[PDB]
Amino acid sequence: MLQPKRTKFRKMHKGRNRGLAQGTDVSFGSFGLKAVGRGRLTARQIEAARRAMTRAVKRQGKIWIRVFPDKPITEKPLAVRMGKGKGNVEYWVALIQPGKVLYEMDGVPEELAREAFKLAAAKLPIKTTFVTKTVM
C-alpha cells in the first residue's frame, strides 16, 4: 500500500475536512474518476481500488493515481482508558474533498473505461462519477 517514505513527524492533529478540491480537470489521460462525496480514503482502499480496475483491462493503458495518503490516522488500543498519550499510527488516509480527481487512466476504449471504473467505485466509500477530459 501507499505510504510516505520519511515524513517529518510521527503523529498529526485530527483536523476538519472542509471546502472543495483543487484537482478538478482530467489533466493527464482522458478518463478520470471525480469524487462527489466528502470523506477520507485509507491506503488499503487505495490499493484495492486500483487492483480491481487494473485487472479489468488486465494490462491495458496507463493508469495514474492522483491521491496519496498524507494524514497518519492513529487508533487507541482496546481496554485502554482515555488520555495516557496519543496512540500509535495504524493507517494512512487521504482526505477527500468534493470535486477531487481520483484515479485517472488513458489508453483504453471508453465503454470499458466506464466499466472498469464501475468495478473500482464499488470498492470506494465515496460516491464518485466518471469524468472525461475536455479541451482546456
Binding site: 478540491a21 462527489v36 470535486g99
Partner: protein, 94 residues
C-alpha cells in the same frame, strides 16, 4: 459559427452571483481593448449544451448584446467542481 444570446447584468456581488446560478443563468466578463470591461450575463443551459464542440473554443464567438453583436474568444472556463454545470467563462474581446 456558434451564436450566444446574452445581456448586461447589474448589481453584482458574491450572493448576487449565487442568486443567479440557482436560476439557470450564470455570469461572465468580456474584456480586452482600449475600453472598459463588460460584465455580461448569459443563459446557462444554451451554452453548456454547445460547449462540447471544439468550435466553441476555436472560433470568434458571436455574442450579441442589446443589438450590438461582438466577436470574442474564450479565455478560460471556471466550471463547477463536481456538478456537471459551470460557474464562469472569460471572453477576451479578440
Amino acid at each position: 459559427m456558434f451564436t450566444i444570446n446574452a445581456e448586461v447584468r447589474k448589481e453584482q456581488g458574491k450572493g448576487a452571483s449565487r442568486r443567479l446560478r440557482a436560476a439557470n443563468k450564470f455570469p461572465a466578463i468580456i474584456y480586452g481593448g482600449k475600453e472598459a470591461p463588460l460584465a455580461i450575463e448569459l443563459d446557462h443551459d444554451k451554452v453548456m449544451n454547445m460547449q462540447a464542440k471544439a468550435e466553441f473554443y476555436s472560433e470568434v464567438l458571436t455574442i450579441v448584446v442589446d443589438g450590438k453583436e461582438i466577436k470574442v474568444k474564450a479565455q478560460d472556463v471556471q466550471r463547477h467542481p463536481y456538478k456537471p454545470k459551470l460557474q464562469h467563462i472569460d471572453f477576451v474581446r479578440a
